[PDB]
């Protein structure tokens, strides 16, 4: 069983070179023979590989006090109001490098607000991950058409963020 | 100009000598098998998407090659990239070669149709059973 | 569509470093939080002969350790996060990690913990000269 | 510069299995047009591995086809939990236009793995 969550997003299915991913699966089957790798001199490694990752299969449920559990249950969720407010985001998949990720675009919420923006994703770099802009296309739907006129004109992160901690720090500061 | 001239003429053969007009399109009377949604039949039209460049020869006589470069819609742009990077193997197929330009402040793509032939099949079995 | 990476069983594990940003003491309370480790390590190979610098382009490895491979030995870069680094991400991505027998179970918290010395290039205490 | 065809190819569900008798009521995803000739179908879509046969009442309900399917197209639909298996069987003997506007709806519809 393999997931989504951190699966590579790009179309380039030359495994790397081990040195290079880190976990035991994104290894080409140059390395595993018996369950083992083995170094090759035969081939040096590589240093030209731009790929986006996946971003899902999360299912976040560690079990510390050190941190309180964000996902509040039934009641606790029921007895609080004053701070009942929406959270949905649409998304969009991209196109010729790459395709595979979820990735967001307009951020809707109770505010009567929804916040445009570009989509940047994780390619992953020989050193780390660099946090890249890449090409963005709506999905294929037909009633997604209405989202044409919204991957030309967005927003990065910084100002997003900045904007929208700031309609909560006006909103809900009360 | 020429910059662009120059620049479609990419790697090869660059004896370019176009043609064309400067940096507009072409207009061409060319007989079509056309079936959309509304029109339809084989007939002969008046097509103009497209820059054409005759390129020449050594001693700088003409020579029946040619490179033709339309323009068109981003989103296409890209289905026909990741189409003939699908498929740039079979050699009946006239080696492509795609980039982004710019004519004004505008990033207008192109792809560049490289050594075809003044005609098509359709001006011959057109112009032959009519 | 890509290629496949993580096993699911441990998703949780990677979730705790995926969305913190105090994640070193994070995932050291969570090696301390109910759980077993990060089941996902390359596994490398070598005849167990040389020094016992771990970073190394080629296994450079002890009679008594074992190789594993030297990017996947970061957990600051194992989960494609930000990195304090100054300049600005993790070094050990490219080389090998031959990890002495005892502390070999998970080269995360040792690659945190513990870092290279410039005497014997060996990890500090496994072994050392170091007076 | 020659565009093939804008679609209205529809899809039901309905009845098939592995044999004449094998197929049960509601298993199979035809897809049709509805053509001079009634409902004229195309295409099944389905999940189980192999399907050989399919049944659809007539175009006003007298008896059940007896249909045979072929040896299904393998692919992979998405579905929330992950990759999905799936096959495209095709009415046998069905020439390469319908075959075609059939891909055409259904890639559509259905973006795979
Ligand atoms: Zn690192
Ligand atoms: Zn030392």
Redesign the pocket.
């Known amino acids: 069983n393999v997931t989504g969550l951190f699966k590579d997003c790009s179309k380039v299915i030359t495994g790397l070179h081990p040195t290079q991913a880190p976990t035991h699966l994104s290894v080409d089957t140059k390395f595993k023979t018996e369950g083992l790798c083995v170094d090759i001199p035969g081939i040096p490694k590589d240093m030209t590989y731009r790929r986006l990752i996946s971003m899902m299969g999360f299912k976040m449920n560690y079990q510390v006090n050190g941190y309180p559990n964000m996902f509040i249950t039934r009641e606790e969720a029921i007895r609080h109001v004053r701070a009942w407010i929406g959270f949905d985001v649409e998304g969009c998949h991209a196109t010729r490098e790459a395709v595979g990720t979820n990735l967001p675009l307009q951020l809707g919420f109770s505010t009567g607000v929804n916040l445009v923006a570009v989509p940047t994703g994780y390619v992953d770099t020989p050193n780390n991950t660099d946090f890249s802009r890449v090409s963005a296309k709506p999905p294929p739907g037909d009633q997604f058409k209405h989202l044409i006129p919204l991957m030309y004109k967005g927003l990065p992160w910084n100002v997003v963020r900045i904007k929208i901690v700031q309609m909560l720090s006006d909103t809900l500061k009360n | 100009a020429q910059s662009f001239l120059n620049r479609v003429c990419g790697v090869s053969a660059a004896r370019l000598t176009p043609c064309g007009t400067g940096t507009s399109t072409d207009v061409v009377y060319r007989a079509f098998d056309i079936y959309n949604d509304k029109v339809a039949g084989f007939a002969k039209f008046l097509k103009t998407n497209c820059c054409r460049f005759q390129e020449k020869d050594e001693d700088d006589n003409l020579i029946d090659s040619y490179f033709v470069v339309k323009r068109h819609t981003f989103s296409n742009y890209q289905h026909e990239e990741t189409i003939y990077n699908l498929l740039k193997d079979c050699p009946a197929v006239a080696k492509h070669d795609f980039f982004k330009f710019r004519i004004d402040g505008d990033m207008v793509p192109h792809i560049s149709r490289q050594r075809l032939t003044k005609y098509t099949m359709a001006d011959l079995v057109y112009a032959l059973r009519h | 569509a890509g290629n496949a990476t993580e096993v699911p069983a441990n998703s949780t594990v990677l979730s705790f470093c995926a969305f913190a940003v105090d994640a070193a003491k994070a995932y050291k309370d969570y090696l301390a939080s109910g759980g077993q480790p990060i089941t996902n390590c390359v596994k490398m190979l070598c005849t167990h002969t040389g020094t016992g610098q771990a970073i190394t382009v080629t296994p450079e490895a002890n009679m008594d350790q074992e190789s594993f491979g030297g990017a996947s030995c970061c957990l600051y870069c194992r989960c494609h996060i930000d990195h304090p680094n100054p300049k600005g991400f993790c070094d050990l991505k490219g080389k090998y990690v031959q990890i002495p027998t005892t502390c070999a179970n998970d080269p995360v918290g040792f690659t945190l913990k513990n870092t290279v010395?410039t005497?014997?290039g060996?990890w500090?205490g496994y072994g050392?000269?170091?007076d | 510069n020659n565009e093939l065809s804008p679609v209205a190819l529809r899809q039901m569900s309905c009845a098939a299995g592995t044999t004449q008798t094998a197929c049960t009521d509601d298993n199979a995803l035809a897809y049709y047009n509805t053509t001079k000739g009634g409902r004229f179908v195309l295409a099944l879509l389905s999940d189980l591995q192999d399907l050989k046969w399919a049944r659809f009442p007539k175009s006003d309900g007298t008896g059940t086809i007896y249909t045979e399917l072929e040896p299904p197209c393998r692919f992979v639909t998405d579905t929330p939990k992950g990759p999905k298996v799936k096959y495209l069987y095709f009415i046998k003997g069905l020439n390469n236009l319908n075959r075609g506007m059939v891909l055409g709806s259904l890639a559509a519809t259905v973006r795979l793995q």
């Open positions: 010395c005497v014997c060996m500090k050392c000269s170091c």
